[PDB]
Amino acid sequence: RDGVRGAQAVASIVSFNNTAFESYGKEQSINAPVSQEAAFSYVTALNYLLNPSNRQKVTIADATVVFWAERSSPAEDIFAGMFDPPESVRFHVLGLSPNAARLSVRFWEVDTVGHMLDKVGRHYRELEIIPQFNNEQEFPSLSTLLR
DNA sequence: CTGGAGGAGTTTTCGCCATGCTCAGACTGGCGAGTTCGCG
Protein backbone atom coordinates (compact mmCIF):
# COMPACT_ATOMS: atom_id res chain seq x y z
CA ARG A 1 0.00 0.00 0.00
CA ASP A 2 2.67 2.51 1.06
CA GLY A 3 5.35 1.24 -1.31
CA VAL A 4 5.50 -0.36 -4.75
CA ARG A 5 1.94 -1.47 -5.43
CA GLY A 6 1.34 -5.19 -5.88
CA ALA A 7 4.80 -6.42 -4.87
CA GLN A 8 5.91 -8.68 -2.04
CA ALA A 9 6.07 -7.25 1.47
CA VAL A 10 9.86 -6.89 1.12
CA ALA A 11 11.44 -6.68 -2.32
CA SER A 12 14.88 -5.86 -3.68
CA ILE A 13 16.57 -4.75 -6.87
CA VAL A 14 19.69 -6.91 -6.53
CA SER A 15 19.54 -10.57 -5.54
CA PHE A 16 21.24 -13.77 -6.69
CA ASN A 17 19.24 -16.46 -4.91
CA ASN A 18 19.49 -19.09 -7.69
CA THR A 19 22.55 -20.80 -9.14
CA ALA A 20 21.60 -20.06 -12.74
CA PHE A 21 22.20 -16.36 -12.04
CA GLU A 22 25.80 -16.71 -10.82
CA SER A 23 29.05 -16.43 -12.76
CA TYR A 24 32.82 -16.73 -12.40
CA GLY A 25 32.38 -18.62 -9.14
CA LYS A 26 30.98 -15.67 -7.20
CA GLU A 27 27.93 -15.85 -4.96
CA GLN A 28 25.28 -13.83 -3.15
CA SER A 29 25.51 -10.03 -3.39
CA ILE A 30 29.29 -10.27 -3.76
CA ASN A 31 28.42 -10.99 -7.39
CA ALA A 32 28.21 -7.18 -7.76
CA PRO A 33 30.38 -5.09 -5.40
CA VAL A 34 29.02 -1.94 -3.76
CA SER A 35 30.14 -0.20 -0.59
CA GLN A 36 27.83 -0.74 2.36
CA GLU A 37 27.01 2.89 3.14
CA ALA A 38 26.38 3.50 -0.56
CA ALA A 39 23.92 0.61 -0.58
CA PHE A 40 22.17 2.08 2.46
CA SER A 41 21.96 5.56 0.96
CA TYR A 42 20.02 4.91 -2.24
CA VAL A 43 17.76 2.39 -0.52
CA THR A 44 16.76 5.00 2.05
CA ALA A 45 16.23 7.60 -0.68
CA LEU A 46 14.02 5.25 -2.67
CA ASN A 47 12.00 4.41 0.44
CA TYR A 48 11.55 8.11 1.18
CA LEU A 49 10.34 8.94 -2.33
CA LEU A 50 7.82 6.10 -2.09
CA ASN A 51 6.20 7.72 0.94
CA PRO A 52 2.66 8.82 -0.04
CA SER A 53 2.84 11.79 2.34
CA ASN A 54 5.33 13.42 -0.04
CA ARG A 55 3.61 14.33 -3.31
CA GLN A 56 6.18 12.82 -5.68
CA LYS A 57 4.55 9.45 -6.48
CA VAL A 58 1.77 8.46 -8.86
CA THR A 59 0.30 5.22 -10.19
CA ILE A 60 -0.27 4.75 -13.93
CA ALA A 61 -1.50 1.47 -15.37
CA ASP A 62 0.64 -1.18 -13.67
CA ALA A 63 3.82 0.83 -13.08
CA THR A 64 4.38 3.23 -10.21
CA VAL A 65 6.12 6.44 -11.28
CA VAL A 66 8.49 8.56 -9.20
CA PHE A 67 10.03 11.88 -10.15
CA TRP A 68 12.09 14.54 -8.43
CA ALA A 69 13.55 18.00 -8.91
CA GLU A 70 13.93 21.07 -6.71
CA ARG A 71 10.19 21.61 -7.29
CA SER A 72 7.39 19.20 -8.14
CA SER A 73 4.03 21.01 -8.21
CA PRO A 74 3.76 21.16 -12.04
CA ALA A 75 4.87 17.57 -12.65
CA GLU A 76 2.39 16.54 -9.96
CA ASP A 77 -0.35 17.70 -12.33
CA ILE A 78 0.36 14.60 -14.44
CA PHE A 79 -2.17 13.12 -12.01
CA ALA A 80 -4.76 14.75 -14.27
CA GLY A 81 -2.58 13.66 -17.19
CA MET A 82 -4.22 10.28 -16.69
CA PHE A 83 -6.98 10.60 -14.06
CA ASP A 84 -8.76 13.36 -16.02
CA PRO A 85 -6.93 14.04 -19.28
CA PRO A 86 -6.93 17.69 -20.47
CA GLU A 87 20.84 24.49 -8.78
CA SER A 88 19.54 20.92 -8.97
CA VAL A 89 18.74 18.26 -11.53
CA ARG A 90 15.39 18.80 -13.23
CA PHE A 91 12.84 16.01 -13.48
CA HIS A 92 14.43 12.63 -13.36
CA VAL A 93 11.59 10.23 -14.14
CA LEU A 94 11.68 6.55 -13.21
CA GLY A 95 8.98 3.96 -13.85
CA LEU A 96 9.26 0.40 -12.57
CA SER A 97 6.98 -2.62 -12.41
CA PRO A 98 6.87 -5.42 -9.82
CA ASN A 99 7.70 -9.07 -10.25
CA ALA A 100 6.68 -11.68 -7.70
CA ALA A 101 9.27 -10.56 -5.14
CA ARG A 102 11.71 -8.47 -7.20
CA LEU A 103 11.45 -5.26 -9.20
CA SER A 104 12.17 -4.41 -12.83
CA VAL A 105 12.72 -1.09 -14.58
CA ARG A 106 10.14 -0.22 -17.22
CA PHE A 107 11.51 3.04 -18.63
CA TRP A 108 13.83 5.87 -17.69
CA GLU A 109 13.84 9.50 -18.85
CA VAL A 110 15.60 12.72 -17.86
CA ASP A 111 13.90 15.09 -20.29
CA THR A 112 12.59 18.52 -19.35
CA VAL A 113 9.10 20.03 -19.69
CA GLY A 114 7.49 16.69 -18.90
CA HIS A 115 5.75 16.68 -22.27
CA MET A 116 3.98 13.51 -23.38
CA LEU A 117 2.54 15.16 -26.50
CA ASP A 118 4.15 12.45 -28.64
CA LYS A 119 1.11 10.24 -28.02
CA VAL A 120 -1.38 12.56 -26.33
CA GLY A 121 -0.73 15.31 -28.87
CA ARG A 122 -1.26 12.87 -31.72
CA HIS A 123 -4.23 11.40 -29.88
CA TYR A 124 -5.89 14.79 -29.58
CA ARG A 125 -5.06 16.03 -33.07
CA GLU A 126 -6.68 12.89 -34.47
CA LEU A 127 -9.91 13.87 -32.69
CA GLU A 128 -10.20 17.40 -34.09
CA ILE A 129 -13.63 18.41 -35.42
CA ILE A 130 -15.42 21.75 -35.66
CA PRO A 131 -18.16 22.04 -33.00
CA GLN A 132 -21.89 22.58 -33.46
CA PHE A 133 -22.65 25.06 -30.68
CA ASN A 134 -20.40 27.96 -29.76
CA ASN A 135 -20.36 27.01 -26.06
CA GLU A 136 -18.87 23.52 -26.42
CA GLN A 137 -15.57 22.44 -24.87
CA GLU A 138 -12.60 21.50 -27.03
CA PHE A 139 -11.03 18.75 -24.88
CA PRO A 140 -13.53 16.09 -23.75
CA SER A 141 -12.57 13.64 -21.03
CA LEU A 142 -12.45 9.92 -21.70
CA SER A 143 -15.27 9.48 -19.20
CA THR A 144 -17.57 11.70 -21.25
CA LEU A 145 -16.67 9.95 -24.51
CA LEU A 146 -17.26 6.47 -23.08
CA ARG A 147 -20.58 7.48 -21.56
C1' DC B 1 33.25 -51.36 7.99
C1' DT B 2 32.50 -47.40 9.68
C1' DG B 3 32.93 -42.47 9.74
C1' DG B 4 32.29 -36.94 8.39
C1' DA B 5 30.47 -34.22 5.27
C1' DG B 6 29.54 -31.71 0.78
C1' DG B 7 26.11 -31.51 -1.88
C1' DA B 8 21.25 -32.16 -3.32
C1' DG B 9 16.64 -31.65 -2.12
C1' DT B 10 12.54 -29.97 1.00
C1' DT B 11 10.41 -26.95 4.66
C1' DT B 12 9.76 -22.25 7.40
C1' DT B 13 9.61 -17.46 8.16
C1' DC B 14 9.12 -13.32 6.22
C1' DG B 15 4.15 -9.18 6.68
C1' DC B 16 0.28 -8.15 5.58
C1' DC B 17 -6.03 -0.96 3.48
C1' DA B 18 -7.78 4.18 0.47
C1' DT B 19 -9.26 8.32 -5.22
C1' DG B 20 -13.69 12.94 -7.24
C1' DC B 21 -21.35 15.72 -11.29
C1' DT B 22 -22.38 19.77 -14.41
C1' DC B 23 -24.11 23.06 -19.19
C1' DA B 24 -26.68 25.44 -25.76
C1' DG B 25 -27.71 27.73 -32.00
C1' DA B 26 -27.40 29.09 -36.29
C1' DC B 27 -30.00 30.55 -42.81
C1' DT B 28 -33.26 32.53 -45.86
C1' DG B 29 -29.46 31.61 -51.14
C1' DG B 30 -32.48 33.62 -59.29
C1' DC B 31 -28.68 28.58 -64.71
C1' DG B 32 -28.85 30.03 -71.29
C1' DA B 33 -29.72 31.07 -76.26
C1' DG B 34 -29.35 26.15 -81.00
C1' DT B 35 -29.69 24.13 -87.51
C1' DT B 36 -31.16 18.42 -91.25
C1' DC B 37 -30.51 16.04 -96.78
C1' DG B 38 -31.60 15.85 -102.46
C1' DC B 39 -32.52 12.28 -110.60
C1' DG B 40 -32.34 9.36 -114.05
Automatic annotation (TrEMBL):
It comes from the Bacteria. This is CRISPR-associated protein, CT1133 family. It comes from Nitratidesulfovibrio vulgaris (strain ATCC 29579 / DSM 644 / CCUG 34227 / NCIMB 8303 / VKM B-1760 / Hildenborough). The lineage of its organism: Bacteria, Pseudomonadati, Thermodesulfobacteriota, Desulfovibrionia, Desulfovibrionales. The chain holds residues 205 to 408 of 612 of the full protein.
